[PDB]
Amino acid sequence: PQVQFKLVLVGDGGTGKTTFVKRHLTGESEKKYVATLGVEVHPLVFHTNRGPIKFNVWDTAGQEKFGGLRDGYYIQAQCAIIMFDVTSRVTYKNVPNWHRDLVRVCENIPIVLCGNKVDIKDRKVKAKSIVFHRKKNLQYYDISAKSNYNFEKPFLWLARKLIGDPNLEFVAMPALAPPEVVMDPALAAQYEHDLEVAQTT
């Protein structure tokens, strides 16, 4: 039977959750609408050195703007991605709230913290301010949904955590929507170095 995990994708409205999950073309063409919960589940296959693994990513239909999400959304999640927007400081301010909501219902599942929109010139939530992950087996990645930047990173970290294999690799990138903006190789380099510099503090 196919190896697959429910992944819940939470975070403030407007952080780019829908834009992000949709980069994965087959996940978008094969997505399933769940009316009872107002959710779309995107089946995201990744081909690893040990075979295919499927992340069934649960994307909201906007309800997160009006309150916490219901239990049935979280139920049986095996991993999660928490997203904020590095152009909106309040979205990062809400991260602990999502974590709390998530852990209340799912326990100690593998979780990755993502700061989306790093393609945008005037960044507000920089490396040195990003601290929530350090404390709780939370890995962090900068991402840019619109540019596909670091798209595979959260998925690879979760794969390695769920399978229990540190040496797991993706043999090939999934077919993704072509970037709508360009991620400056220099910014990527500086933001990447900024995170390592910070991780030593």
């Binding site: 697959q4 429910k6 399933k32 769940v34 009872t36 919960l37 089946p43 069934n56 049935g72 139920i75």
Partner: peptide, 27 residues
Amino acid sequence: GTWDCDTCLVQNKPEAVKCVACETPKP
């Protein structure tokens, strides 16, 4: 043996009548 929900893809244990997640009945 457990079963996959055709609506939301969640795995339910063989006993359940409807999906513990989306309340969708078992085929």
